[PDB]
C-alpha cells in the first residue's frame, strides 16, 4: 500500500519521539519511487513530495495558482490572503508595497531590541527552574516583535494567538469565522487610528500607500494586517518551539552551538531545513503533467516541503542536523515569487533567541513530569515544550 493514499498534513502520525519525523522519513523513502501521489483526504488531492517535483510546481505559476495557498482554506471570512493568496500581476503590485519595511535593512533595526526582549523574557522564569519554552519564549518573542511592527500592543499576545488559532484550526465554523471577525473589528480600529495619527510602523506605511495613484481600500488593509500577523506569529512560534525542544534533549547539538557561536547562523538554516513548519497548496488552473502525473483544473496539489527537505537527491545525509551544511537550498521558506517575506527576519529572530537562551541557560532538559505536544496542520511544530533547568539569576528587574 502507499503512504500517500491517506497523507493528511493535519493528521501526520507521530512517532515515539513525539514528532511526525519517522513518518516523514518513510514518506521520503517512498517518494524516491513515486514523488507525487494521490491522497483521499479532503475529498482527493495531490501530495507532491520530491524536491524536483516541488521545484517544478512552484516555478510553474501558469498552471499552479496561489488561490489554493491554504487547503483547506484558512478562515478569513470574505477577505483573501494578501500576497500569499494572489497570482501576478496583482501579487507583485501588493508585495512591492511592503518590500522595503521587510528588507533586511529595515528589520535589522530591531535586532538589539529583540535581544533585550528575549533577555527580559528569560528573566521572567530563570529563578523558577522551570517553564514551558513554547509559551514562555517561543510564542512571545515573535508575537511581541510582530506587534511592534504592526503598531499593536506587545502585551496582548494572547488575543493575537486566539485569532490565529481561529484562522488555522477551530473546527466549528461559526467559532472560527466569529473569532476571525474579532480580528477584523480590531484591524478596523487600528486602521482608523493610523489614518489620523500615522506612526513609523508597517501598517501606517501601507495605509498611506497607493496603487495606480489610488489609496488602498479598507478591505486591502485588513488583508495586509491579517497576512502579516499570521506570518509574523504562527510559523515563527512553532519553529522556535521545535528548536527549543530539540536543544533540550540533543546535548551534542547544544554543546556545539555553545562552543561555536559563530556557527549559529548556519545552524539556524539547517534547523529551518529540518523543522520548517510549513506546507503550502497550489490550485491547478489547467491540465498539467509533472512527472508521471497529470493534474486537472480545480484539483489541489499540497507541497510537502518537509519531505523534499529530506530528499537524498538534494541533500547529503538528509536525516542528520549537519550544522556546517552549505549551500543549504531547503524549501522551508518557499521559492520563487512567493518566497517568504519574513525570511531574513525569522533568521534573525532564531539567531537571537538561540544565542541568548544558550548564553543564559546552558543547562536544561525536558521536564520528565509534563508532556510535550506537537501541533499539526499547514504550520506544524511543538506547541508545548516543558523544560527544567538549574535556577538562575535575572539580568534586570
Ligand atoms: C519559521 C518562520 C516562517 C516560515 C517557515 C514561513 C514560510 C513561508 C512560506 C513557505 C512561504 C511561501 C508560500 C508559498 O509558496 O505560497 C511564505 C510566505 C509568506 N510569509 Fe513566511 N514563513 C515564516 C515566517 C514569516 C514571517 C516572520 C513573516 C511575517 C512577516 C512571514 C510573512 C510571509 C508573507 C507575507 C508571505 C507571502 C509572500 C508572497 O506571497 O509573496 N513569514 N512563508
Strand order of the largest sheet: 1-2-10-7-3
Radius of gyration from the CA trace? 21 Å
CATH architecture label name: Orthogonal Bundle
CATH topology (fold) name: Cytochrome p450
Output the CATH homologous superfamily: Cytochrome P450
In the residues, how many domains can be counted? Answer: 1
CATH class annotation: Mainly Alpha
What fraction of the residues are assigned to beta strands by DSSP? 5-15%
Strand element count: 14
Helical percentage: 40-55%
Shape: globular
What class, by secondary structure content? alpha+beta
Could you say which small molecules are bound to this protein?
protoporphyrin IX containing FE
Question: What is the string of helix and strand elements?
Answer: HEEHEHHHEHHHHHEEHHHEEEEHHEEEE
Largest sheet: 5 strands, mixed
Number of helices: 15
Family: Belongs to the cytochrome P450 family.
Keywords: Heme, Iron, Metal-binding, Monooxygenase, Oxidoreductase
Pfam family, one: p450
Subunit structure: Homodimer.
Q: Which SSEs are present, and which pair or pack?
A:
Layout: H1 21-31, E1 36-39, E2 45-48, H2 51-59, E3 64-65, H3 90-99, H4 104-107, H5 111-126, E4 130-132, H6 133-138, H7 140-149, H8 157-168, H9 173-196, H10 202-207, E5 210-211, E6 214-215, H11 218-249, H12 251-259, H13 264-275, E7 280-284, E8 288-290, E9 293-295, E10 300-303, H14 305-308, H15 343-360, E11 365-366, E12 373-375, E13 381-384, E14 386-388
Parallel strand pairs: 2-10
Antiparallel strand pairs: 1-2, 3-7, 4-14, 5-6, 7-10, 8-9, 11-14, 12-13
Helix pairs in contact: 5-7, 5-15, 7-11, 8-9, 9-11, 11-15, 13-15
Protoporphyrin IX containing FE is lined by residues 66, 69, 83-84, 95, 227-228, 231-232, 235-236, 239, 276-278, 280, 332-334, 338, 340-342, 345-346.
